[PDB]
Backbone:
């Protein structure tokens, strides 16, 4: 109200409204689902178009051979944050000959987003990110909020109507975690999960976007007729 | 190297050798010492190969941007000056570059000499490199404004040959160009070994050499 | 640009069937003066890596602190710091190699020659060299300074190529290293009798031996040597 | 005074075939009269069907290769996973080398692969970034020993057809990958005999449309 | 470059400057004009290190032309010479000084007088009836000391200048390829096309 | 953050005026009147000190008339402290020009430089403008005798006669009435004092409430002399013209 | 440094500071530009509220940027000096780097770019100035006349006016100026420029300034008497 | 007042949303992509008959293979065009090749959100970037001040955008020829424009693989307008 003019101002109840408004931009964004087993991690994203003449906005970005994320909210902010990850992943390789741990990648994103919430002049990031990866401690899935909060999860979803997919994964938890050494079945569970967040529209060939990373699987994105198999 | 270029009635001739040396060792038998900046602009290369390539290709970027901003081709005079100003930034830092900016613009054909010191000279005829003295000898005694395209191409070709023979650091092959108002025209790569014997027989020159 | 002041001489090392061995004497020379006799030039990093350093000691002490700080920093927000996300020899080496090359590129080098010896997570032997120029190389045997000239020839008689590594035992490798250290004591004027030896094995882990001495030395034949040519008495 | 440069010896050789290319190099690494390693790889697969070798000062060579590999990675990120063509890689490397015009990478660099028409390609660089496409190039320590041999045996220089006596040249027939590898091995065996910094081992990387293949051969260890 | 001469007569200033440009052991050009018009009634000749000469001259030219447009007024030769001197005195203590020696020949329209200023690369300014830079003065000043009068005509100034060039051509080891002569008077700047 | 307390000194009003410049001019309209009159053989500067005291040391006091160099002087209207900042900058600018070209700075060039500094404060920086209006009286060999004025907007104009400060509307009408082109300095002196005497808010115009100056070619032969009048000399010229 | 964003968008998609800068131009004295067949004429209003002015030394409304290009304006006088100075520096900088004088279109594009930069830079306000830039390109006999404004947009005009009551004089020019046959001579071009100003000016005495620019750097400013003769001839024909 | 980079309660940047309103006031610009080429057309919208309409440059060349049309505060586009031209030619310098249209568009869009308290506000202009490369063929992009860019088969921006976009919705199909696209741009421009469409107040342009980017002559466009009138009168 009087305390939402900038990010440097707490409200009387201890809230940061600019951060909460940035969080709101994620809810307006298109749905994306993340889930993993012990061998693989999968991202599934519902891409959004402007109209019938337009292309479908890309949702998934590659950060390294073993890591990547999906976005929901302001796409340019995702580009800035993914570019930062690319550099950090790359710094770890060039200097330490070491693949960047997914947990440490989350810590770096948290700290980058935090600086924008405490200083005057700047603004919080207006995007949420689901980071998947495979490192020395196996498969991983992270959820990034521009408040700075990063959370390691078995599965999750963000964006509009994401609560439906999140409930599904909460029921299916014991099943999909056990899908080891079977990438197609893990993707199926993700496609079935994101389907719980659909209304009116359904999953078409240029609508659906899928990514996967695993034990002997580099981070690869599937679009177009490559995802027709899963429709 | 040996390079030359001269204006005449039907445009400008550009001839260069193709040798590259690293001490007394011949590092390359065939190196391109001309850059096609645009269809109406050429640049010769003498001195440090890296310096010649980098800065003249950077000139081409800057000449290209000129066309986009102004909707018109850059003049030879302006192109040569951009390059001389580039040299003037790295003044005394150790660059080694000698080049002739050859082309055709609204004032007709244009030829400008430019070097690492920032020197920028307009003129009808120039020659750069370790063998420029040998080239000038043939050029000065045989040059006319009234030269035919055929005879002019031969003069530049013959002048490089003279240098390639005497100068140890010049040779390999001869690259010829002819610049007109419709643009530059490449007139091929000519091996000096074969060209020498041919010229000797046809012309009767190089009598002292046995063949 | 500097000059080295207090210096450490040869660091020698070699691979064997189950790991690596590395050794270095305990001397800190000040030109021709044998100034400091209790200097440890083998520095362990965790339980899987030993960094052996020769050259300027003040720069060695600086590097020693960088490695100590590296372990601290790796443990931060790392529940697997003593397990899957523990420091590897290849991480430690590449870090040092980055630092050395950066410093030489600023014309302010760390005046050292370093050998990183260790065993990787998968049981593979790690042995790689780096120096003040940022020059890196790996070989079944590695040595710095005088060791390169005198130790390598002896160690290469045991492991002449990659295929000799599985045939070489820890007893044979240690014996060769200890003999090399004796030869260096005979012939390197900036060496000492006292030295340290470290073994990093994929089964038995890190064994760090201190206060070792060169023994079984041959000097008796000196009594018979008289004059420099014609002198009999 | 601190000398930031050094000489790690070694010799490299790139030959461009009709539909293939090879990039060979010895595996010996040295300083002065000492051997550092008998097997220290010098030729690398950089991705996108491109092979590369930076011969001379190893520290600068490793740095350049590392930066080019990095340049390939960011080329994929920035341009929708587009393949980096051999000519594009060459021009990119020129700018990498010239970025240190006043404190050069002390290396003679060669890259090899295939052009966009499927034909064999070799590009040669000097330490400051001048480059050009070639058919044949030896670089490094024994470069002066090997190049004349390749002028004679690859481009058939000074070779004429018997009976004509200098009137008709030997025609420039293309060489197969098996024929090229023979010339490569004989080049390095000859260089090993008369050059002290050449020996120990020979590693060859062959590039075709099918991918990158490796071949290793022992050399004299003296 | 090498030889630049200047002489101030009754009603004009005459500048003579060599045509040669050498690079290595080869004379690249024998028709080079070592001068820039700073303003309609002010001419500056120059000589010094290669590249620096033209860059400095054109920089001065731009500054004076900028002043002329801003004020719609031509600076006096004295004012221009002082500006040039300051730039050179500023330059000599720079990281990389400009090694350029100049003569500034101008006609002051206010005072109706010709004026010649000699300035070296250190910023050493002197107003003279006749001047030179480098070794040129060693050969020519004895002739000028002898023959010069302040009431000389432009034609007599040119004749005395010819004698100076003839002496240079006889006693210098250096072939400077003749000179381009320019006259600065009340009507402006013009070039003597036959010399 | 800090934005909350920013007045924004460099913005347009909806009508296209610069608030601070307009309010600075309002400030200047309460300042003591300063008058400049240009004649064929010299220039006059006359100015009124604001409600003085008997205990003010007048002979060592200077609030209106300042010397920029030997050829150029200024009359001030507005904040004296603001004016001194600008005056010292102008003095330096004149010396820079003299060092560079070895000639005294032309009047307009000095005026333009100061006016450009004033302009800068109205367009960038976020600082309040200088609450000062100048009357420049000067001489050079190009245009001879010149009068200029500058105000906080950084706009300057040339004048034959002009007033700044209080009652300029009334003062300008009086000057426009009695001024003629063939006028001389002694006549201009009388006009300046008569105008002040009629426009003043004080009961009577006396020597202790005035600063006065002339720039004359009335110097021995072709040269210019600046005369800052002393208290006794102002008292004499007041009696001469018939005001006291 | 002072970084405050003064020029910003409003809910309706307007940048008020740029629009208020146009109001400053509306307040400024009228300026007019008319190009004939072989010339361009720049006319400028001088408000007669200011008498006792010294017209010798008072800043003239038309300013030479180079020997072949001129610039007049309407709006804040102090602001115009900054644009003029920048333009003059760029003109010499262009000659120095490219060895050709600027084209009129290039010079306009530069001045317009400066104005634009001041609409999206922190801590600065837009120029309260619109300019008319006229001249002839080197070795070209085609007349050039351009206009710029605070927003930074620019365009070429056969004839144009800016400043106070510009709406009225533009109305006059739109009906009087024929594109198929523009003022063939200098006289006709000046006459039309004076006529257009007489719709707005008040008195035709010292209130009208005229500057004729012809090809090959031939620029002259008409005197009071020369202009007065045009004013006399126009009204004598009008009495009919 | 309030921050320039402030979020609204709905999760949108106020300034970005307000710049979009400025673009709605701009003159109409239309782009249509086909397999024979991409056509770009614009409404010139001269404010007066004395304004020489040929000096209105709302269609612009970025490279030989990339063109660009603009709508909104067109003065803001000049620095964007300058950056695009620099990016295009610089990539040619570094990689000895043409730059991808998407990569060029991405480079332009990276400038968009570089505003705060960098430039002081977002751009008040939208761009239709049309081009061709070997990888993805003929492409049309819509670059907004939000930093977002969508690829389009056909797109209209400016004051008559939603009306034109609805028309492009019905008319566009994947088998359009270049000639058909040209007439279609002219048809829709004529529909949404206030004044009567002719060769002087409207401009056409195209990008083909062979000839590259070309702005159409007024004589060439005039014939296409006459061809349009006759075919509409044909039924
Ligand atoms: C003659 C050969 C003078 O020696 C001539 O100037 C050529 C000019 C030239 C220009 C462009 C490309 C190639 C050649 N110069 C050279 O050949 C120079 C000679 C030279 C050496 C050192 C210098 O110090 C600044 C200046 C000039 N040679 C080189 O530049 C040489 C170091 N480079 C190469 O040989 C590069 N090649 C080697 C073969 O692989 C591709 C790159
Ligand atoms: Mg050998």
Residues:
């Amino acid at each position: 109200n009087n305390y939402d003019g900038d990010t440097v101002t707490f409200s009387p109840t201890g809230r940061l409204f600019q951060v909460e408004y940035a969080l709101e931009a994620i809810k307006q964004g298109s749905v994306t689902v993340g889930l993993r087993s012990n061998t693989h991690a999968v991202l599934v994203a519902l891409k959004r178009n402007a109209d019938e003449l337009s292309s479908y906005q890309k949702k998934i970005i590659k950060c390294d051979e073993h890591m990547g994320l999906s976005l929901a909210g302001l796409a340019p902010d995702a580009r800035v944050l993914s570019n930062y990850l690319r550099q950090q992943c790359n710094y770890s390789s060039l200097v330490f000959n070491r693949k960047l741990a997914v947990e440490r990648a989350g810590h770096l994103l948290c700290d980058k987003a935090q600086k924008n919430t405490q200083s005057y002049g700047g603004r919080p990031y207006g995007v949420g990110l689901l980071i998947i990866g495979y490192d020395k401690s196996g498969a991983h899935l992270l959820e990034f909020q521009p408040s700075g909060n990063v959370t390691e999860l078995y599965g999750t979803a963000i964006g509009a109507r994401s609560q439906g997919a999140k409930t599904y994964l909460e029921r299916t938890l014991d099943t999909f975690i056990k899908i080891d050494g079977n990438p197609d079945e893990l993707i199926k569970a993700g496609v079935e999960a994101i389907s719980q967040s659909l209304r009116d529209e359904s999953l078409t060939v240029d609508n659906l976007s899928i990514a996967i990373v695993g034990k002997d699987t580099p981070f690869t994105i599937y679009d177009g007729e490559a995802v027709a198999k899963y429709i | 190297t040996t390079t030359l270029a001269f204006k005449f009635q039907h445009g400008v001739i550009v001839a260069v050798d193709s040798r590259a040396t690293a001490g007394s060792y011949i590092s390359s038998l065939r190196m391109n010492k001309v850059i096609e900046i645009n269809p109406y602009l050429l640049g010769t290369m003498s001195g440090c190969a890296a310096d010649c390539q980098y800065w003249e290709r950077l000139l081409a970027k800057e000449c290209r941007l000129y066309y986009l901003r102004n909707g018109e081709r850059i003049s030879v005079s302006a192109a040569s000056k951009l390059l001389s100003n580039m040299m003037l930034q790295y003044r005394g830092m150790g660059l080694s570059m000698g080049s002739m900016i050859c082309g055709w613009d609204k004032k007709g054909p244009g030829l400008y000499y430019v070097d690492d010191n920032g020197t920028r000279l307009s003129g009808q005829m120039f020659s750069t490199g370790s063998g420029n003295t040998y080239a000038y000898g043939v050029l000065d005694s045989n040059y006319k404004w009234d030269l035919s395209v055929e005879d002019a191409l031969y003069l530049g070709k013959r002048s490089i040959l003279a240098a390639a023979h005497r100068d140890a650091y010049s040779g390999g092959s001869v690259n010829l160009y002819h610049v007109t108002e419709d643009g530059w025209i490449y007139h091929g790569n000519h091996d000096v070994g074969e060209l020498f014997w041919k010229v000797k027989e046809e012309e009767g020159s190089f009598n002292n050499v046995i063949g | 640009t500097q000059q080295p002041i207090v210096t450490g001489t040869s660091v020698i090392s070699m691979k064997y069937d189950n790991g690596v061995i590395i050794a270095a004497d305990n001397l800190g020379s000040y030109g021709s003066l044998l100034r400091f006799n209790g200097v440890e030039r083998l520095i362990p990093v965790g339980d899987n890596t030993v960094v052996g350093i020769s050259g300027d000691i003040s720069d060695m002490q600086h590097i020693e602190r960088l490695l100590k700080d590296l372990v601290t920093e790796n443990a931060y927000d790392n529940p697997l710091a003593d397990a899957e996300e523990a420091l590897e020899p290849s991480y430690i080496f590449e870090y040092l190699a980055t630092v050395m090359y950066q410093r030489r590129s600023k014309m302010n080098p760390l005046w050292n020659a370093i050998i990183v010896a260790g065993v990787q997570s998968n049981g593979d032997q790690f042995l790689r060299y780096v120096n003040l120029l940022g020059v890196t190389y790996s070989s079944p045997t590695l040595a710095t300074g005088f060791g390169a000239h005198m130790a390598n020839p002896l160690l290469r008689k045991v492991v002449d190529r990659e295929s000799d590594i599985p045939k070489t035992t820890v007893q044979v490798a240690e014996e060769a290293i200890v003999n090399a250290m004796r030869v260096l004591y005979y012939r390197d004027a900036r060496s000492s009798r006292n030295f340290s030896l470290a073994i990093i094995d994929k089964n038995t882990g890190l064994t760090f031996k201190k206060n070792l001495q060169v023994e079984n030395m041959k000097w008796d034949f000196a009594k018979d040597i008289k004059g420099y040519g014609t002198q009999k008495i | 005074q601190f000398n930031p440069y050094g000489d790690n010896g070694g010799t490299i050789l790139g030959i461009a075939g009709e539909d293939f290319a090879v990039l060979a190099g010895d595996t010996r690494n040295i300083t002065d009269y000492s051997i550092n390693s008998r097997y220290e790889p010098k030729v690398f697969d950089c991705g996108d069907n491109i092979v590369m070798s930076a011969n001379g000062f190893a520290a600068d060579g490793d740095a350049l290769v590392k930066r080019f590999k990095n340049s390939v990675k960011w080329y994929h990120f920035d341009h929708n996973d587009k393949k980096l063509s051999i000519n594009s890689a060459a021009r990119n490397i020129q700018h990498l080398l010239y970025s240190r015009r006043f404190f050069p990478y002390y290396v003679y660099n060669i890259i090899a692969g295939l052009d966009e028409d499927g034909k064999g390609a070799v590009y040669s660089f000097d330490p400051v970034g001048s480059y050009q496409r070639e058919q044949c190039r030896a670089g490094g320590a024994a470069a002066s020993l090997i190049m004349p041999f390749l002028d004679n045996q690859v481009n058939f220089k000074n070779q004429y057809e018997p009976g004509t006596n200098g009137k008709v040249k030997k025609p420039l027939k293309y060489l197969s990958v098996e024929e090229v590898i023979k010339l490569v091995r004989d080049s390095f065996t000859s260089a090993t005999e008369r050059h002290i910094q050449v020996g120990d081992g020979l590693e060859i990387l062959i590039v075709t449309k099918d991918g990158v293949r490796k071949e290793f051969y022992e050399l004299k260890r003296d | 470059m090498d030889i630049i001469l200047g002489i101030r007569v009754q009603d004009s200033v005459i500048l003579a400057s060599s045509k040669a440009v050498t690079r290595g052991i080869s004379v690249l050009k024998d028709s080079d004009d070592k001068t820039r018009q700073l303003s309609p009634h002010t001419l500056m000749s120059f000589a010094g290190e290669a590249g620096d000469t033209v860059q400095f001259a054109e920089y001065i030219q731009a500054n004076i032309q900028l002043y002329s447009i801003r004020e719609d007024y031509e600076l006096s030769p004295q004012a221009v010479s002082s500006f040039v001197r300051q730039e050179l005195a500023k330059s000599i203590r720079s990281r990389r000084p400009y090694q350029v020696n100049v003569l500034i020949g101008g006609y002051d329209k206010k005072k109706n007088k010709p004026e010649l200023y000699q300035i070296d690369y250190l910023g050493t300014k002197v107003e003279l009836p006749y001047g030179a830079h480098g070794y040129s003065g060693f050969y020519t000043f004895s002739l000028l000391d002898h023959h010069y009068r302040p009431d000389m005509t432009t034609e007599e100034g040119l004749d005395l200048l010819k004698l100076c060039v003839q002496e240079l051509e006889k006693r210098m080891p250096m072939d400077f390829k003749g000179v381009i002569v320019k006259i600065v008077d009340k009507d402006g700047i013009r070039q003597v096309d036959d010399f | 953050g800090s934005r909350r307390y920013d007045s924004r000194t460099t913005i347009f009003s909806p009508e296209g005026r610069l608030y601070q410049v307009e309010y600075a001019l309002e400030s200047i309209s309460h300042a003591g009147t300063a008058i400049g009159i240009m004649a064929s053989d010299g220039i006059v500067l006359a100015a009124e000190r604001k409600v003085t005291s008997t205990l003010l040391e007048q002979d060592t006091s200077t609030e209106k008339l300042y010397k920029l160099n030997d050829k150029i002087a200024v009359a001030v209207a507005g904040l004296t402290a603001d004016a001194e900042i600008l005056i010292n900058t102008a003095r330096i600018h004149a010396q820079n020009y003299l060092k560079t070209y070895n000639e005294d700075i032309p009047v307009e060039i000095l005026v333009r430089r100061l006016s450009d500094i004033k302009q800068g404060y109205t367009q960038h920086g976020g600082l309040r403008p200088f609450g000062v209006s100048f009357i420049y009286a000067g001489y050079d060999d190009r245009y001879g005798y010149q009068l200029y004025t500058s105000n906080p907007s950084g706009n300057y104009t040339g004048w034959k006669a002009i007033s700044v400060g209080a009652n300029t509307s009334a003062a300008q009408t009086l000057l426009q009435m009695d001024y003629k082109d063939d006028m001389k300095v002694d006549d201009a002196i009388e006009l300046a004092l008569k105008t002040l005497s009629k426009t003043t808010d004080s009961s009577a115009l006396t020597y202790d409430r005035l600063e006065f100056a002339t720039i004359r070619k009335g110097a021995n032969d072709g040269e210019v002399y600046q005369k800052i009048f002393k208290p006794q000399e102002i008292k004499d010229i007041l009696v001469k013209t018939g005001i006291t | 440094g002072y970084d405050r964003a003064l020029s910003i968008f409003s809910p309706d998609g307007h940048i008020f500071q740029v629009e208020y800068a146009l109001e400053a131009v509306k307040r400024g004295t009228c300026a007019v530009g008319v190009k004939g067949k072989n010339c361009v004429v720049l006319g400028c209003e001088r408000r007669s509220t200011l008498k006792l002015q010294d017209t010798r030394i008072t800043p003239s409304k038309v300013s030479k940027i180079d020997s072949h290009v001129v610039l007049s304006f309407s709006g804040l006088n102090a602001d115009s000096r900054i644009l003029i100075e920048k333009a003059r520096v760029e003109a010499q900088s262009h000659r120095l780097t490219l060895e050709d004088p600027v084209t009129v279109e290039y010079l306009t594009r530069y001045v317009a770019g400066v104005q634009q930069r001041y609409t999206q830079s922190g801590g600065v306000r837009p120029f309260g100035v619109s300019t008319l830039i006229a001249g002839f390109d080197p070795r070209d006999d085609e007349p050039k006349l351009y206009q710029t404004e605070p927003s930074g947009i620019y365009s070429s005009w056969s004839a144009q006016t800016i400043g106070r009551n510009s709406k009225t004089v533009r109305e006059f020019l739109e009906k009087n100026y024929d594109r198929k046959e523009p003022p063939a001579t200098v006289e006709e071009c000046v006459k039309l420029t004076v006529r257009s100003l007489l719709e707005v000016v008040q008195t035709g005495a010292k209130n009208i300034e005229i500057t004729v620019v012809k090809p090959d750097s031939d620029i002259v400013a008409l005197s009071s008497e020369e202009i007065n003769q045009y004013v006399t001839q126009i009204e004598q024909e009008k009495q009919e | 007042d309030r921050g320039v980079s402030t979020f609204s309660p709905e999760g949108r940047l106020f300034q970005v949303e307000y710049s979009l309103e400025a673009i709605k006031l701009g003159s109409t610009a239309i782009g249509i992509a086909t397999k024979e080429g991409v056509v770009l057309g614009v409404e010139k919208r001269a404010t007066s008959p004395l304004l020489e309409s040929d000096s209105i440059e709302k269609i612009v060349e970025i490279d030989r293979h990339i063109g660009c049309a603009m709508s909104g505060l067109t003065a803001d586009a000049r620095s964007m065009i300058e950056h695009a031209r620099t990016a295009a030619v610089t990539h040619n310098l570094y990689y000895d090749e043409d730059i991808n249209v998407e990569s060029l568009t991405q480079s332009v869009c990276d400038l968009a959100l570089r505003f705060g308290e960098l430039m002081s506000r977002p751009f008040g202009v939208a761009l239709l970037i049309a081009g061709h490369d070997a990888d993805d063929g003929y492409q049309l992009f819509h670059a907004e001040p939000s930093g977002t860019f969508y690829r389009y088969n056909a797109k209209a921006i400016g004051s008559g955008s939603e009306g034109a976009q609805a028309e492009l919705l019905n008319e566009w199909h994947s088998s359009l020829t270049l000639k058909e696209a040209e007439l279609l741009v002219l048809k829709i421009l004529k529909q949404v424009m206030e004044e009567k469409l002719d060769e002087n107040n409207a401009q056409l342009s195209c990008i083909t693989k062979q000839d590259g980017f070309k702005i159409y002559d007024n004589e060439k466009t005039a014939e296409l307008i006459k061809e349009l009138k006759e075919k509409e009168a044909a039924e």
